[PDB]
Design a protein around this ligand. Structure first.
Ligand SMILES: Nc1ncnc2c1ncn2[C@@H]1O[C@H](COP(=O)(O)OP(=O)(O)OP(=O)(O)O)[C@@H](O)[C@H]1O
Ligand SMILES: Nc1ncnc2c1ncn2[C@@H]1O[C@H](COP(=O)(O)OP(=O)(O)OP(=O)(O)O)[C@@H](O)[C@H]1O
Lengths: 148, 148
């Protein structure tokens, strides 16, 4: 479909070029590449831009990088409807991330619901709301703006 | 009062020696030191052990290091009763940390209350409960255990 350069991706998703390069180096995001040269050689898909938008949003919660990476991996594997363009934003489900003390399973991801979320807080557990619709709305609005 | 070596501090608070060295290097915690030599030369106070316990607990929430450091600085300045041994644990107030998107003020700290905390979650805001009493209880129990 539509492909975007690194500077275009950086400006659309409000990730710095330095962040994109680091996330490429670490395998967080895998844009399409070709041999090195003076011309453009790295291109992000719309799904990559969505992954960038997720990563920037997770990092804005204060969550450490390793857990943001783990969250993005879990979202892409377990919640692929987030990246599908199948579900219109009105029907996407809001989620919540619950960090744990288990190195093997360091992050729980669940559907958001107020009763369970408030119960977790009253037990002393950190809750990180993750509004799937806002994610997709934010990229869509950055992109509609991007042309103009 | 009582002073503890780095290995004693590491084992009491379940921070690795590598973490203590890094937090010393960065100024997170400032144990008492003297000139270098073959003998012991770094000593943690009970208040330092409390600061270590806070730092290990904040890092367990998933909060990134810079914000844990900022949280510890804000707690020591704004909530010195946490480190005073004034308030018995039964009267210490539970808190909550709310990470923000402002670089100048990247973290809000507030008294915990369920109504406000649930309202923040429903608005999409991350909430990190911080149980002051559990902090002081945990070190006290690690220390009562430590002798035996
Ligand atoms: N919100 C909080 N603020 C401060 N300390 C906390 C908070 N939540 C948990 N802790 C501390 O984290 C440690 C582990 O807590 P948690 O209840 O998850 O496990 P635990 O009860 O030690 O596990 P186990 O059931 O295996 O003994 C405990 O020492 C607890 O005091
Ligand atoms: N829980 C969440 N999940 C996903 N995206 C979120 C969540 N909370 C906030 N955002 C996104 O973070 C960005 C900033 O949110 P916030 O409401 O704090 O500020 P804002 O409304 O952009 O600020 P202003 O009032 O200055 O325009 C928004 O794009 C919003 O969509």
């Amino acid at each position: 479909g539509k492909f975007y350069t690194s500077t275009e991706a950086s400006e659309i998703t409000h990730c710095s070029r330095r962040q994109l390069q680091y996330w490429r180096e670490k395998g967080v995001i895998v844009p399409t590449v070709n041999s090195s040269g003076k011309g453009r050689n790295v291109y992000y898909s719309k799904a990559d831009l969505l992954a960038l938008t997720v990563m920037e949003q997770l990092l804005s919660t204060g969550l450490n990088f390793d857990l943001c990476y783990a969250a993005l991996q879990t979202l892409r594997k377990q919640e692929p409807w987030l990246f599908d363009e199948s579900v219109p934003e009105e029907k996407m489900k809001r989620l919540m991330l619950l960090p744990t003390r288990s190195p093997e399973q360091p992050l729980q991801l669940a559907e958001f619901d107020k009763q369970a979320a408030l119960e977790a807080l009253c037990h002393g557990q950190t809750v990180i709301p993750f509004w799937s619709d806002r994610i997709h709305q934010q990229l869509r609005e950055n992109l509609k703006s991007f042309s103009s």
